[PDB]
């Protein structure tokens, strides 16, 4: 102490060789340095709650690595043992008991509005992700990926592909198999538009299968609406064409542009509108609230008049859902893993089973003891497990 | 039992004479005829849930008034009157439950057909037919540069997705393993 | 004008 709590590098520079020569001297200094590593990172990272707070967190994690790598590679000749200390300390300054969600917010702001500057800044991001312990990053990201892909708000395609290209290297095709499908569609969608334009503006986007986490007709529209099935007559077959009226929009010449209140304006701008809802009246009530919001003179039950007092151009529940939406897949994978492991070995210890399943499924999810406790309930519900009654620690094959 | 307890041979014959035969026949008749109303009532999945719930109770009900050497025979006829009567209806509608998958449905389904004889073979070929559809899909219309990579990057996922379900929803069964292998030995 | 349309191919 007092030589690692501060540093005059001459002192421990002399110190290292002597303890490397004599046996059993080194281990103490490893933990001694590890203890001092945390102090920075437990400092200057707390008391940080403000606007644009995800940026500051990543703008403070990196400097701890940066300063401490130079010393362990200069004063003391590089040693994998000293590398191990820094890593373990860094694997416990950003995973204590939000930050995994904050990382997605970090990526969201940068891409949304120089390219070399963007690449240089994104280069540092890949370092922090390797220390995070990831399901939220795998699922939560596609949600604002979709909002950037559609409704405009799409950046240089090069940056979008570069993010994927860099992230794919770290975890291979398995982690990010899906998202390669989304970006390919938009290039195909533009090409798909070109061919069917000749069958005659109405522009149309297609969406691949149901892998995307994305989820009365106007009387003037049917002529083009049912003409789209001629595209099936051309090159598609058996696919259920899905006019998803909820999320879509469109710039139309009413004589805003989201189909909820365009569906309202289909009778407004032109009881009868209540029949035209083709849906529950609560959703239409939401759409009339949209009118009541700003600058729209209803006679109001649904009695409506006009306003002569006329831009020229027309949520915690999300993460509340995402908290358990991933968890369901966690329970399913826990059941799977339980079946495979106790049916394979058949003679293993059940606490050793807990450890083995922890080792096998560590990459898939962070293990939790209670979920493992509740595994046997459904298996014994059907008596699927041939639960070894002589010793629950030992197993017998289910058949 | 106690009166003929010291009767050296045929220990339980009188129990059969006075109790076993009518309690067997009349109870079986009533339990079989009651299921007809529920068959008329609701959906096939609702009916399967009903029959499972009814099967659960009779075991607890049975232990209250019988000798240990009679646990097997009652549930045998109780099963038959429930499943073998409508084996045709059960073999039918196996489609739309394997063409998609809400795993609760065939998860309930597996045990009932494993109990009754000759029920299982149909579902094996039924699943085998659906296996090919993927593999005959997303593998065709693939002619481009570095095309060998994509083919192997598509064969493996068919094994990967389908191994988890046949090892989770339905307890592992070498018969189901045989179906997947045969289907995979004809996609490449 | 321009209706913004999106539709997913499902159960090909």
Residue numbers in the entry:
A (entry chain A): 283 to 379, 386 to 401, 407 to 426, 428 to 494, 506 to 520, 528 to 567, 576 to 590, 597 to 622, ...
B (entry chain F): 189 to 376
C (entry chain R): 25 to 36
Which sentences from the paper describe this structure?
CRL2FEM1B is an oligomeric E3 ubiquitin ligase composed of CUL2, FEM1B, ELOB, ELOC, and RBX1. FEM1B is the substrate recognition protein of the oligomeric CRL2FEM1B E3 ubiquitin ligase that has been implicated in sex determination, apoptosis, colon cancer and Alzheimer’s disease. Cullin-RING E3 ubiquitin ligases (CRLs) are multi-subunit complexes composed of a catalytic Ring-finger protein, a cullin scaffold protein, substrate adapter proteins, and a substrate recognition protein. Here, we describe for the first time the cryo-EM structures of oligomeric CRL2FEM1B in three different states as follows: unneddylated CRL2FEM1B, dimeric neddylated CRL2FEM1B complexed with BEX2, and monomeric neddylated CRL2FEM1B complexed with FNIP1/FLCN.
